[PDB]
A paper describes a structure:
In order to explore the functional roles of the PWWP domains, we determined the crystal structures of the PWWP domains from 7 different human proteins, namely, BRPF1 (bromodomain and PHD finger-containing protein 1), BRPF2, BRPF3, MUM1 (melanoma associated antigen (mutated) 1), DNMT3A, DNMT3B and HDGF2 (Hepatoma-derived growth factor 2). HDGF (hepatoma-derived growth factor) and the HRPs (HDGF-related proteins) consist of a highly conserved PWWP domain in their N-terminus and a variable region in the C-terminus. PWWP domains in this subfamily of PWWP-containing proteins also exhibit DNA binding ability and some of these HDGF proteins are implicated in development. By fluorescence polarization assay, we found that the PWWP domains in BRPF1, BRPF2, HDGF2, MUM1 and the N-terminal PWWP domains of WHSC1 and WHSC1L1 show weak binding affinity to histones with H3K36, K3K79 or H4K20 methylation. HDGF2 binds H3K36me3, H3K79me3 and H4K20me3 weakly.
Author numbering: 2 to 93
Amino acid sequence: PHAFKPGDLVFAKMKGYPHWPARIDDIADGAVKPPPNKYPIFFFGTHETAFLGPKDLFPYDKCKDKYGKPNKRKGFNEGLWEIQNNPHASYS
């Protein structure tokens, strides 16, 4: 098993939110230097971005049984559709 790379599918954990379907984005695409050992995360559904370290990143194939369940939070269910059906699309 390897370090996280752009295009990796995850659930990403932030405080006040459930584990959220997300992907690792490419930094070589932005014009922004990431904090040390943090990754640019794109959240499905909301189409928001944040920087998160590996402790908040849960690989999607391993964790979807547990986290890949409908939620009432705004964007979550759309985000589930997007990660399962077109995770690598332009949502921009």
